Amino acid sequence: MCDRKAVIKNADMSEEMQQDSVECATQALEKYNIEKDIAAHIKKEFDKKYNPTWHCIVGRNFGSYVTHETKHFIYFYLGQVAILLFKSG
Template identity: 70%
Template structure:
C-alpha cells in the first residue's frame, strides 16, 4: 500500500479529530476514485461520529470562504487532492 502524503493547511479542530479526518479521508481515497464520492463518504462518517451537520469539499481546483462552528474546520491535502471539511448548522 502506498504511503500518502498529508499536509494540513489550516485547522480549527482538536488534534484527535484532525487525525480522524485524515484516517477517514485515506479510507475514502482507497475506496473511491470520484471526488464527489470521496466527499460524500467523509461527510457521512463525520456526521456519524461527530453529529450533523458536516460539509465536505474535495478537489484539485476550488476556492472557498466558509463560516464554521468553533473547533469544527480543517483544510488539508492528501497527495495532490484538497479536502475542506467543516461543520455548520
C-alpha cells in the same frame, strides 16, 4: 503508482478529530476515486459519529468561502488532491 502525502493547510479542532479526518480522507480516497464520493463519505462519517452537521469538499484544485461552527474545522492537502471538512449546519 500511488502518490499521496498529507499537507494540512489549516485546522481548528481536536487533534484526534482532525487526525480522524486525515484517515477518513485517506481511506475515503482508497474506497472512492472521485471527490464527490470522497467528500460525501467523509461528511456522513463525521455527521453520524461526531453529530451533524459537517460539510465536506475534495478537489485537485479549487477556491471557496465558507462559515462553520467552532472547534470543528479542518483542511489539508493530500497527494494530488485536497480534503476540506467543517461543521456549518
